[PDB]
Amino acid sequence: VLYVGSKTKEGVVHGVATVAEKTKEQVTNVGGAVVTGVTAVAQKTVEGAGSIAAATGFVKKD
Amino acid sequence: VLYVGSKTKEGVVHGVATVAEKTKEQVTNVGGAVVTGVTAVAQKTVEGAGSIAAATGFVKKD
Amino acid sequence: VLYVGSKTKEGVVHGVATVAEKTKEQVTNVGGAVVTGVTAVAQKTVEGAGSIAAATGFVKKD
Amino acid sequence: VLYVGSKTKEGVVHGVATVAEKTKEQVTNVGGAVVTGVTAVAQKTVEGAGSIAAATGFVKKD
Amino acid sequence: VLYVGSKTKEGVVHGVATVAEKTKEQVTNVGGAVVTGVTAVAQKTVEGAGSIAAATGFVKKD
Amino acid sequence: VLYVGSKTKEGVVHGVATVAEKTKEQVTNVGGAVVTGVTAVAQKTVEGAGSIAAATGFVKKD
Amino acid sequence: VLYVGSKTKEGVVHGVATVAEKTKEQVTNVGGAVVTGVTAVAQKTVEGAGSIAAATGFVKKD
Amino acid sequence: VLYVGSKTKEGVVHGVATVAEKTKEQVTNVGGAVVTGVTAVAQKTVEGAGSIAAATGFVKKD
Amino acid sequence: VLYVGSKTKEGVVHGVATVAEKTKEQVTNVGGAVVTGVTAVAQKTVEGAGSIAAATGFVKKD
Amino acid sequence: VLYVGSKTKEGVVHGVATVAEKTKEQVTNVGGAVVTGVTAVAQKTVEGAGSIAAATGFVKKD
Amino acid sequence: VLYVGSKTKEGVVHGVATVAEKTKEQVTNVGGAVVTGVTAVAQKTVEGAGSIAAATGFVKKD
Amino acid sequence: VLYVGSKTKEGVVHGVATVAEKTKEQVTNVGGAVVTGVTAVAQKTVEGAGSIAAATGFVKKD
């Protein structure tokens, strides 16, 4: 009997349970960038810029 | 009997349980960058800028 | 009998339980950068700037 | 019988339990950078600037 | 019987329990940088500036 | 029977229990940097400036 | 304008969120009465014995 | 404008959030009565014996 | 403008948040009555014996 | 403008937040009555014996 | 403007926050009655014997 | 402007915060009645014997 092994995890989400009970959810945006309600998001990136739930406005390079 | 092994975890979220009971959730944005309600987010990045729930406005390079 | 092993954890969130009972949650943003409500977020970064729930305005390089 | 092993933890959050019972939560931002409500956030960074819940305004390089 | 091992912890938060019962929580920001409500945050950084719940305004390099 | 081992801790927070019962919590900021409500935060940094709950205004390099 | 009304609740459960992460859940019963794992149960009874999650053994009337 | 009304609650449970992370949960019963794991249970009873999570053994009336 | 009203509560539980992190939870019962793990339970009873999480053994009426 | 009203509470539990981090929780019962782990329980009773987390053994009426 | 009103409370528990970090919690009972771990329990009783966390053994009426 | 009102409290517990860090908590009972760990318990009783955390053994009426 040997039983050799390994179990890994990299950017793993497991076991979430959520409840949301809003009554009036409004969003008003003029020229900006809104991000809302992200939940249970997993990612893995190699040799790149990983980024979750980011926001930017007015990227004016000149 | 040997029983050789290993279990790892890297940027792992597990076992969350959330409740939100708002009655009037408003968001007003003019030219900015709003980020709201991020929950249970896991990530792993290699040779890159990892960033979760970031915000910026008016990136004017000139 | 040997029983050789190892279990590690790197940027791990596990076992959260949250309750939020707001009645009127408002956000007003003009030209800035707002970040709200981050919860249960895990990350790991190698050779990069890791950053969670950051905010900046008016990045004017000239 | 040997029983050789090791269990480590690096930037680990586990066992949080939170309750928030606000009645009127307002945020007003003009040109700045607000960060609110961060909870149960774990991170690990290698050869990079780690930073959680940071804020800056008016980064004017000229 | 040997029983050789080791368990470590580096930047670990575990066992928090919080209650907040505000009735009117307001925040007004003009050009600054506000940071509020950080709780149960763990981090580890190697060869980088670690920083939790920092704030700065008016970074004017000229 | 040997029983050889070691358990360490470095920047570890465990066993907090908090209650906050404010009725009217206001914050007004104009051009400065406010930091409020940090709780149960652990960190470890190697070859970098660690800093928790810091604030600065008007970093004018010229 | 009148706006006359009323909203009631009698034995009402609303807004639960649960997570269970057992690894080996065993139950052995010999002649008894086991009750396990009741969750989010609401009831209303008029002129009768209401009873939730009850147990009895050996009801020997002679 | 009148705005006449009323909102009541009688045996009401709302806003629970639970996490259970057992590894080996055993129950052994011989002739008794076990009750385990009741959570978020609401009831209302009129002219009757209300009873939640009760246990009895050996009800021998002779 | 009148604004006449009333909001009541009778046996109401709201806003609980729990975490349990056992590793080996055993229960052994022989002829008795065990009750465990009751949480967030609300009740209302009129003209009856209300009773939550009660236990009895050996009810021998002769 | 009148603003006439009233808000009452009778046997109300609200705002609990709990953490339990046992490693080996055992219970052994022989002929008795054990009650454990009651938390956040509210009740109201009219013309009846209210009783929470009670225990009795050997009720031998003869 | 009148602003007539009243807010009462009768057997109300609100704002608890608890942490328990046992390592080996044992209970052994033979013929008795044990009660353990009651927390955040509210009750109201009218024309009846209210009683929380009571214990009795050997009720032998003859 | 009148501002007539009244706010009362009767058997009310609010604002507790507890920490318990035992390592080996044992209880052995033979024929008696043990009561342990009561915390944050509120009650109100009218025309009845109120009693919290009571214990009795050997109630032998003959």
Ligand SMILES: CNc1ccc(-c2ccc(/C=C/c3nc4ccc(OC[C@@H](O)CF)cc4s3)nc2)cn1
């Ligand atoms: C600073 N923090 C750190 C630093 C380092 C670590 C760390 C480093 C290395 C490892 C290696 C884990 C391995 N597990 C197995 C399992 C089976 C196997 O099979 C071999 C094949 O020949 C079949 F027999 C080969 C391997 S290697 N784990 C954790 C964690 N945290």
Ligand SMILES: CNc1ccc(-c2ccc(/C=C/c3nc4ccc(OC[C@@H](O)CF)cc4s3)nc2)cn1
């Ligand atoms: C800093 N954090 C870190 C750092 C390192 C690690 C880390 C590094 C290496 C490993 C390797 C895991 C392996 N498992 C097996 C299983 C079977 C196998 O089969 C071989 C084939 O010949 C059939 F026998 C070969 C292999 S290699 N795991 C984790 C984790 N975390």
Ligand SMILES: CNc1ccc(-c2ccc(/C=C/c3nc4ccc(OC[C@@H](O)CF)cc4s3)nc2)cn1
């Ligand atoms: C500063 N903080 C730190 C610093 C260092 C560490 C740290 C460093 C190294 C390790 C290595 C862990 C390993 N586990 C196994 C399991 C099986 C295996 O299998 C071999 C294969 O031949 C089959 F037999 C090979 C390996 S290597 N763990 C933690 C943690 N924290």
Ligand SMILES: CNc1ccc(-c2ccc(/C=C/c3nc4ccc(OC[C@@H](O)CF)cc4s3)nc2)cn1
């Ligand atoms: C300043 N703070 C610090 C500093 C250092 C540390 C630290 C450093 C090293 C380690 C190494 C841990 C290891 N565990 C195993 C388990 C099995 C294994 O298997 C080998 C394979 O051949 C199969 F047999 C190899 C290894 S190495 N842990 C913690 C923590 N904190």
Ligand SMILES: CNc1ccc(-c2ccc(/C=C/c3nc4ccc(OC[C@@H](O)CF)cc4s3)nc2)cn1
């Ligand atoms: C200033 N504060 C400090 C400073 C130093 C430390 C510190 C430094 C080193 C360590 C090393 C811990 C190790 N644990 C194992 C377990 C198994 C194993 O397996 C070997 C493999 O051959 C299988 F047998 C190898 C190793 S190394 N721990 C803590 C903590 N705090």
Ligand SMILES: CNc1ccc(-c2ccc(/C=C/c3nc4ccc(OC[C@@H](O)CF)cc4s3)nc2)cn1
């Ligand atoms: C100024 N304050 C300070 C200064 C120093 C320290 C300090 C320094 C070193 C250590 C080392 C701890 C170790 N633990 C093990 C366990 C098993 C093992 O396994 C070996 C492998 O061959 C299998 F057998 C190797 C090692 S090394 N701990 C604390 C703390 N505080």
Ligand SMILES: CNc1ccc(-c2ccc(/C=C/c3nc4ccc(OC[C@@H](O)CF)cc4s3)nc2)cn1
């Ligand atoms: C000891 N604790 C206690 C004791 C008593 C109470 C309690 C008693 C009575 C009430 C009555 C509430 C009513 N609400 C409305 C709304 C509209 C309506 O419409 C009428 C129709 O003609 C249209 F206009 C008639 C009615 S009656 N509420 C609470 C609570 N708690």
Ligand SMILES: CNc1ccc(-c2ccc(/C=C/c3nc4ccc(OC[C@@H](O)CF)cc4s3)nc2)cn1
């Ligand atoms: C001890 N606790 C207690 C005790 C009493 C109460 C309680 C008692 C009575 C009520 C009555 C509520 C009513 N609502 C309406 C709405 C419209 C309506 O329309 C009439 C039709 O003519 C059209 F206009 C008639 C009615 S009656 N509510 C609560 C609660 N809790």
Ligand SMILES: CNc1ccc(-c2ccc(/C=C/c3nc4ccc(OC[C@@H](O)CF)cc4s3)nc2)cn1
């Ligand atoms: C010892 N503790 C106690 C004791 C007593 C109480 C208690 C007793 C009575 C009440 C009555 C509440 C009412 N609310 C309304 C609302 C509208 C309405 O509408 C009428 C219809 O004509 C339309 F206009 C009629 C009614 S009656 N509330 C609390 C609480 N706690």
Ligand SMILES: CNc1ccc(-c2ccc(/C=C/c3nc4ccc(OC[C@@H](O)CF)cc4s3)nc2)cn1
């Ligand atoms: C010893 N401790 C105690 C003792 C007594 C009390 C206690 C007793 C009575 C009350 C009554 C509360 C009422 N609220 C309203 C609201 C509207 C309404 O509407 C009328 C309808 O005509 C529309 F306009 C009628 C009523 S009666 N509250 C508390 C509390 N605690």
Ligand SMILES: CNc1ccc(-c2ccc(/C=C/c3nc4ccc(OC[C@@H](O)CF)cc4s3)nc2)cn1
């Ligand atoms: C020994 N300790 C004690 C003793 C006594 C008390 C106690 C006794 C009575 C009360 C009564 C409270 C009331 N509140 C309202 C509100 C509106 C309303 O509306 C009327 C309707 O006509 C619409 F306008 C009628 C009523 S009665 N409160 C506390 C507390 N503690």
Ligand SMILES: CNc1ccc(-c2ccc(/C=C/c3nc4ccc(OC[C@@H](O)CF)cc4s3)nc2)cn1
């Ligand atoms: C020995 N210790 C003691 C003894 C006595 C007391 C005690 C006794 C009586 C009270 C009464 C409180 C009342 N509050 C209101 C509010 C509004 C209302 O509205 C009327 C309706 O007509 C609308 F306008 C009627 C009433 S009665 N409070 C405390 C406390 N402690």
